[PDB]
Paper text:
The structure of deglycosylated ACAN(G1) was solved by molecular replacement using a model generated by AlphaFold and refined to 3.50 Å (Rwork/Rfree = 0.247/0.284). There are two molecules of ACAN in the crystal asymmetric unit. Overall, these three discrete domains form a single structural unit that resembles an inverted letter “L” with dimensions of ∼ 60 × 50 × 20 Å. The interface between the Ig domain and Link-1 buries 430 Å2, while the interface between Link-1 and Link-2 buries 682 Å2. The two protomers in the asymmetric unit superimpose with an RMSD of 1.25 Å over 251 Cα pairs. However, examination of the two protein chains suggests that there are significant differences in the arrangement of loop regions in the Link domains between the two protomers. Specifically, although continuous electron density in chain A made it possible to build the entire Link tandem repeats, two segments in the Link domains of chain B could not be built because of missing or uninterpretable electron density. These segments include amino acids 216 to 240 and 257 to 260. Furthermore, the conformation of the region 307 to 339 in chain A differs significantly from the one adopted in chain B. The conformation of this segment in chain A may be an artifact of crystallization because the single GlcNAc attached at N333 is wedged between the Link-1 and Link-2 domains.
Aggrecan (ACAN) is a large, secreted chondroitin sulfate proteoglycan that includes three globular regions named G1, G2, G3, and is decorated with multiple glycosaminoglycan attachments between its G2 and G3 domains. The N-terminal G1 region interacts with the glycosaminoglycan hyaluronan (HA), which is an essential component of the vertebrate extracellular matrix. ACAN is a large, secreted glycoprotein that spans more than 2500 amino acids in humans. Its N-terminus includes a globular region named G1 that shares ∼39% amino acid identity with HAPLN1 and is composed of an immunoglobulin (Ig) domain and two Link modules. We demonstrate that the single immunoglobulin domain and the two Link modules that comprise the G1 region form a single structural unit, and that HA is clamped inside a groove that spans the length of the tandem Link domains.
Residue numbers in the entry: 29 to 56, 71 to 350
The structure:
């Protein structure tokens, strides 16, 4: 029997959107969809004789849309794409003693990050929240993107605007003053549709980044103006928050503090990368505190985080 996935290998899809992997087989039967992510492989579903049995974790998430209406079409559909769903998907068709397989890499692009232009909380109406997202090399995040970010581990007890004019915030362990509409249950708390002129923070979605982000330093660091002038001296400019988080997502160790474009300094952190300046290999991390952001005096001395 023959199996084919007619799609170029680096299949790129956005965060929170859907995914369709075409898989067609010829049998001169049982279908299995699995996914290898780094070192872990997860069986997504197994179909046979018209019935599909789906992984419990991927319930209402993966499906075979054209099966069994077209019994020779093992096309897979994956909904609500979190950045975890990246990896190499395997479509394997087996009959009796024969079996064939095909693979396809999926790269879920984009990252959802918080923005608050100054240390003052909740200062952006809907329009100016969108403007802040635009000025930080991003768009205003859709609620699906924020849901995927929460499913990936994002948590911040700060209400922020979204694309659908709603104001939400994700939380895994409910805290005092952070329960919202989910009681003491985890989830993405929402305030519903709000008036276009209510002030909150913003949740932005940074999709892609064509240039590169790097640290420009000096023996005495830089004041903010010196950092901007150092970036401009190298034919570059101070990286925005979206560019910073896109570089940090791509694997660049941006944990060290440095001047960003908006006179702010962020310390990106996660459960996988909780340390800075090194790593503690004999220790695993379960919980990690929310991302920290300082709005230092313009005279403070840091590295420059330039983008080119
Ligand atoms: C920090 O922000 C990044 C990007 O917004 C996110 O992926 C990460 O989960 C955040 N960390 C925490 C602990 O919320
Ligand atoms: C990613 O997905 C795998 C398989 O579903 C799961 O075991 C793992 O905990 C997830 N990790 C993150 C960081 O989302
Ligand atoms: C916002 O707009 C509404 C209706 O357009 C108006 O009544 C209200 O005064 C405005 N400001 C605030 C803070 O709600």
């Amino acid at each position: 029997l023959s199996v084919s996935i007619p799609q170029p290998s680096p299949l790129r899809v956005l965060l929170g959107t859907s995914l369709t992997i075409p898989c067609y087989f010829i049998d001169p039967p049982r279908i299995k969809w699995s996914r290898v992510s780094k070192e872990k492989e997860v069986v997504l579903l197994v179909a046979t004789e018209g019935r599909v049995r789906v992984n419990s974790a991927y319930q209402d998430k993966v499906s075979l849309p054209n099966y069994p209406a077209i019994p020779s079409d093992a096309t897979l559909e994956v909904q609500s794409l979190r950045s975890n769903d990246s990896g190499v998907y395997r479509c394997e068709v087996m009959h009796g003693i024969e079996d064939s397989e095909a693979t396809l890499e999926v790269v879920v692009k984009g990252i959802v990050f918080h923005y608050r232009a100054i240390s003052t909380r909740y200062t952006l109406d809907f329009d100016r929240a969108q403007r802040a997202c635009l000025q930080n090399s991003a768009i205003i995040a859709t609620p699906e993107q924020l849901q995927a970010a929460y499913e990936d581990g994002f948590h911040q007890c700060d209400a922020g605007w979204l694309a659908d004019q709603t104001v939400r915030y994700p939380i895994h362990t409910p805290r005092e003053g952070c329960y919202g509409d989910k009681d003491e249950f985890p989830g993405v708390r929402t305030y519903g549709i709000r008036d276009t002129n209510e002030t909150y923070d913003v949740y932005c979605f940074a999709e892609e980044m064509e240039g590169e982000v790097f640290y420009a330093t000096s023996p005495e660091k830089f004041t903010f103006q010196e950092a901007a002038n150092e970036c401009r001296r190298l034919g570059a400019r101070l990286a925005t928050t979206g560019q910073l988080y896109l570089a940090w997502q791509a694997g660049m160790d941006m944990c060290s503090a440095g001047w960003l474009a908006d006179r702010s300094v962020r310390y990106p952190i996660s459960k996988a990368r909780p340390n800075c300046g090194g790593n503690l290999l004999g220790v695993r991390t379960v919980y990690v505190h929310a991302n920290q952001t300082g709005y230092p005096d313009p005279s403070s001395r840091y590295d420059a985080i330039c983008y080119t």
